[PDB]
Design an enzyme around this catalytic site. Sequence first.
Site, PDB file in Angstrom:
ATOM      1  N   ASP A 122      61.971  51.553  38.360  1.00 20.45           N
ATOM      2  CA  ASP A 122      60.681  51.553  37.696  1.00 20.45           C
ATOM      3  C   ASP A 122      59.584  52.253  38.515  1.00 20.45           C
ATOM      4  OD1 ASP A 122      59.162  50.952  35.435  1.00 20.45           O
ATOM      5  OD2 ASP A 122      58.384  49.099  36.334  1.00 20.45           O
ATOM      6  N   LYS A 124      56.580  54.555  39.165  1.00 23.39           N
ATOM      7  CA  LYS A 124      55.457  55.091  38.401  1.00 23.39           C
ATOM      8  C   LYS A 124      54.259  55.046  39.328  1.00 23.39           C
ATOM      9  CE  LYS A 124      55.216  51.551  36.069  1.00 23.39           C
ATOM     10  NZ  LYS A 124      54.982  50.367  35.161  1.00 23.39           N
ATOM     11  N   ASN A 127      53.106  51.594  40.593  1.00 23.26           N
ATOM     12  CA  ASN A 127      53.912  50.843  41.552  1.00 23.26           C
ATOM     13  C   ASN A 127      53.875  51.466  42.925  1.00 23.26           C
ATOM     14  OD1 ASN A 127      54.590  48.950  39.658  1.00 23.26           O
ATOM     15  ND2 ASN A 127      56.579  49.883  39.178  1.00 23.26           N
ATOM     16  N   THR A 160      97.616  50.903  37.301  1.00 20.87           N
ATOM     17  CA  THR A 160      98.064  51.880  36.329  1.00 20.87           C
ATOM     18  C   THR A 160      97.186  51.690  35.109  1.00 20.87           C
TER      19      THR A 160
HETATM   20  N1  LIG Z   1      53.612  44.841  40.562  1.00 24.50           N
HETATM   21  C1  LIG Z   1      53.666  44.499  41.971  1.00 24.50           C
HETATM   22  O1  LIG Z   1      54.654  43.995  42.406  1.00 24.50           O
HETATM   23  C2  LIG Z   1      52.391  44.671  42.809  1.00 24.50           C
HETATM   24  C3  LIG Z   1      52.045  43.739  43.799  1.00 24.50           C
HETATM   25  C4  LIG Z   1      50.843  43.878  44.509  1.00 24.50           C
HETATM   26  C5  LIG Z   1      49.972  44.947  44.239  1.00 24.50           C
HETATM   27  C6  LIG Z   1      48.769  45.093  44.932  1.00 24.50           C
HETATM   28  C7  LIG Z   1      47.627  45.462  44.258  1.00 24.50           C
HETATM   29  C8  LIG Z   1      46.431  45.635  44.922  1.00 24.50           C
HETATM   30  C9  LIG Z   1      45.299  46.074  44.234  1.00 24.50           C
HETATM   31  C10 LIG Z   1      45.456  46.596  42.938  1.00 24.50           C
HETATM   32  C11 LIG Z   1      44.355  47.087  42.221  1.00 24.50           C
HETATM   33  C12 LIG Z   1      43.091  47.103  42.823  1.00 24.50           C
HETATM   34  C13 LIG Z   1      42.927  46.629  44.133  1.00 24.50           C
HETATM   35  C14 LIG Z   1      44.034  46.130  44.849  1.00 24.50           C
HETATM   36  O2  LIG Z   1      43.619  45.744  46.051  1.00 24.50           O
HETATM   37  C15 LIG Z   1      42.254  46.135  46.261  1.00 24.50           C
HETATM   38  O3  LIG Z   1      41.768  46.544  44.978  1.00 24.50           O
HETATM   39  C16 LIG Z   1      46.388  45.439  46.307  1.00 24.50           C
HETATM   40  N2  LIG Z   1      47.524  45.080  46.983  1.00 24.50           N
HETATM   41  C17 LIG Z   1      48.711  44.913  46.322  1.00 24.50           C
HETATM   42  N3  LIG Z   1      49.895  44.548  47.075  1.00 24.50           N
HETATM   43  C18 LIG Z   1      50.320  45.877  43.244  1.00 24.50           C
HETATM   44  C19 LIG Z   1      51.522  45.741  42.531  1.00 24.50           C
END
Ligand SMILES: NC(=O)c1ccc(-c2cc(-c3cccc4c3OCO4)cnc2N)cc1
Length: 285
Positions: A122, A124, A127, A160
């Site tokens: 997945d 993208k 992610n 076989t």
């Molecule tokens: N889908 C996942 O497994 C996943 C886990 C964690 C994070 C993640 C997001 C953010 C984050 C996202 C949007 C805006 C923000 C964020 O932090 C500061 O402002 C930060 N850390 C993460 N590990 C994304 C996907």
Amino acid sequence: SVYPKALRDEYIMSKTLGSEVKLAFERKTCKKVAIKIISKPALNVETEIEILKKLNHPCIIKIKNFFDAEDYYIVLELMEGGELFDKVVGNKRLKEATCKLYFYQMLLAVQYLHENGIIHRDLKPENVLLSSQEEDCLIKITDFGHSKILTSLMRTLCGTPTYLAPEVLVSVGTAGYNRAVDCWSLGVILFICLSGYPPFSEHRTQVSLKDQITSGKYNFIPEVWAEVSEKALDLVKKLLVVDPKARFTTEEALRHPWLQDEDMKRKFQDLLSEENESTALPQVL
Ligand SMILES: NC(=O)c1ccc(-c2cc(-c3cccc4c3OCO4)cnc2N)cc1
């Protein structure tokens, strides 16, 4: 509802980051963490945790803690840069040099996954996470819900055939190339990054999305691509190959001329140690 007592006991919860993912502080260290809440299912999370626990790479998100309760709670390293998606949506576009830096990290990560018999499945922009708001940062791959782990055929191959259906023997040709779907995805991501737009969309075209993708005939808009190096575009072309056996692997991508770029590697190396200063134990001379 409310948060589980065991969660509350170790962490203080805060604002939403995406949607779900929440900001949180670890009581013991007052350090910031991210907590991904997955509502109750059991299987995707079982594997995701098992994978995150075993993996150890700079460009792959680490798990810090886990909570099996009314819902699932997965505690992760916080990525202040946010999602890559947010850097490319609305025809925004990254300077080629930033693309290389990011993509190189993506390549190492996915190479690493493949070396360890794991297929992400997945990949993208959403992610892929940035470590800071600097456009020079570490990226980490996230969200292993859909991952596969790499023998049924192999066992069947030991007898076989004789009672063995035709279609199975025909699958031997391609067996073992599932990891290539990640290389495809990487290709689509690199395209988007460089161009600001998707290779296969339904925007201003009458041929079906399925048809575009199976044909490999992506939407090439020269006005935009002229700004982009020929090396870059060449690498994209080799990843967006319809035949999975012919498609570029991570290794082949890494050996590609577009990535033989010692400056970029330096910056990544510099960014690495800059993050490790925190943990650096003294050591034997
Ligand atoms: N889908 C996942 O497994 C996943 C886990 C964690 C994070 C993640 C997001 C953010 C984050 C996202 C949007 C805006 C923000 C964020 O932090 C500061 O402002 C930060 N850390 C993460 N590990 C994304 C996907």
